Enzyme design. Structure first.
Site, PDB file in Angstrom:
ATOM      1  CG  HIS A  26      -2.144   0.900   1.025  1.00  8.72           C
ATOM      2  ND1 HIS A  26      -3.304   0.731   1.754  1.00  8.72           N
ATOM      3  CD2 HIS A  26      -2.375   1.944   0.189  1.00  8.72           C
ATOM      4  CE1 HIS A  26      -4.186   1.647   1.390  1.00  8.72           C
ATOM      5  NE2 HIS A  26      -3.652   2.389   0.436  1.00  8.72           N
ATOM      6  CD  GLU A  69      -5.733  -0.987   0.460  1.00  5.37           C
ATOM      7  OE1 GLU A  69      -5.416  -1.459   1.581  1.00  5.37           O
ATOM      8  OE2 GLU A  69      -6.281   0.127   0.326  1.00  5.37           O
ATOM      9  CD  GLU A 145     -10.874  -4.125   1.899  1.00  2.00           C
ATOM     10  OE1 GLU A 145      -9.864  -4.772   1.542  1.00  2.00           O
ATOM     11  OE2 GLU A 145     -10.833  -2.914   2.225  1.00  2.00           O
ATOM     12  CB  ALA A 147     -20.793  -1.632   4.397  1.00  2.00           C
ATOM     13  CG  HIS A 148     -14.619   1.823   6.572  1.00  2.00           C
ATOM     14  ND1 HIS A 148     -14.092   2.747   7.446  1.00  2.00           N
ATOM     15  CD2 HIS A 148     -13.626   0.937   6.319  1.00  2.00           C
ATOM     16  CE1 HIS A 148     -12.838   2.430   7.717  1.00  2.00           C
ATOM     17  NE2 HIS A 148     -12.532   1.331   7.052  1.00  2.00           N
ATOM     18  CG  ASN A 205      -1.041   7.644  15.908  1.00  2.00           C
ATOM     19  OD1 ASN A 205      -2.272   7.636  15.931  1.00  2.00           O
ATOM     20  ND2 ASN A 205      -0.325   8.592  16.487  1.00  2.00           N
TER      21      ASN A 205
END
Ligand code: NA
Ligand code: NA
Ligand code: NA
Ligand code: NA
Ligand code: NA
Lengths: 211, 211
Positions: A26, A69, A145, A147-148, A205
């Site tokens: 990624h 990714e 993937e 619907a987060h 982070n």
């Protein structure tokens, strides 16, 4: 690829499993800098081939995934064909480089909205209904993937399922995702609490995004 | 087939035309009772072949149609192939038999809705966005009849054009239709009024449906 017992539990209770290679780039600029580099094909090929050699006998594994990714590079093309040649009994998928590359048998985008197009350059995320009927397109669509479920979320979920049910070539998706990646920390009175990014002095982070 | 002048004008003024054989057997039960009968292949043939012979040289004629509302029979198939064989320069479309038969190059439904399915037995009217993506379907979609302009009408016309513009294989359609088929009658004062079905002592009639 998961801890080995997982596939056995899946075989026995009954779940369809996408077994996914341990390759994710990624962070590369562009995402394919490594996956298009033939110097990296050996390291990549080990990660793909050795999953099959290990996992090919589990009934629950219905789909092989080439990683996640990492853009689209000739290495992906090379390993797709390796899997097709080695295990003709399973379709191979991969989201990288546009979700409809020469490297996937399933149009498997992440977060492609139901009705709204998002016409990003090179890698557009079409509306799933429109994606199917793009000229010369025939393959089925299943979102790798969607619907987060981050915090108060999953709003607009019913819209996916209405479309899944109407369009025969729309065949569902995998929600992102199951469990919150919070880690228990303890306080001054020895009391646990759920902590996310940067709560360990780790930096940079991405904060609550692990959840 | 229209008055010959219609094409001269469509050539010079610039309109794309669908030339269409004089065949509608709508009222047969079932609709293909004659178009499937091999004894109607001679009479049908001449109506298709003698159109192609007359109008083949006009640039305004871009698509031939085999008729209207006459179900789907082997004669359509016979004649579709005849044109395909005599004039490769123009595609053939035909709506009979559920709008996507083996006798049409173009999926050409009539009154198919944008989003809502009308799953009629044997000849369903899928949403046009769904129709294209049906397993194994590749052809373009251009409705031969849509947005019925009867009375205060044409509500939801925008829904159709946002669809055409969004979906590359949705390539528009032909509205139904251009002009109220009303006729002038005269009252006691010699004053002219618009008449529809029923207004000529003609019975049975389908009233204001002519408009
Ligand atoms: Na479906
Ligand atoms: Na995350
Ligand atoms: Na279009
Ligand atoms: Na009547
Ligand atoms: Na009418």
């Amino acid at each position: 690829p998961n801890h080995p017992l997982w596939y056995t539990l899946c075989d026995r209770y009954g779940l369809y499993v996408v077994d996914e290679a341990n390759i994710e780039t990624h962070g590369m600029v562009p995402m394919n800098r490594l996956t298009d580099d033939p110097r990296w094909l050996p390291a990549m090929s080990e990660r793909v081939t050795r999953m099959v050699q290990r996992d090919r006998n589990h009934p629950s594994v219905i789909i092989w995934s080439l990683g996640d990714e990492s853009g689209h590079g000739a290495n992906h093309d090379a390993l797709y064909r390796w899997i097709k040649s080695v295990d003709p009994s399973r379709p191979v998928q991969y989201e990288g480089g546009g979700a409809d590359t020469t490297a996937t048998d399933i149009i498997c985008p992440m977060y492609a909205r139901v009705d709204e197009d998002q016409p990003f350059p090179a890698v557009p995320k079409w509306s799933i209904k429109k994606w199917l009927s793009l000229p010369g397109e025939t393959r089925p669509l299943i979102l790798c993937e969607y619907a987060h479920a981050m915090g108060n979320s999953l709003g607009g979920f019913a819209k996916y399922w209405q479309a899944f049910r109407q369009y025969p070539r729309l065949q569902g998706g995998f929600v992102w995702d199951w469990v919150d990646q919070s880690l228990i920390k303890y306080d001054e009175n020895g009391n646990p609490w759920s902590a996310y990014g940067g709560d360990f002095g780790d930096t940079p982070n991405d904060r609550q995004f692990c959840m």
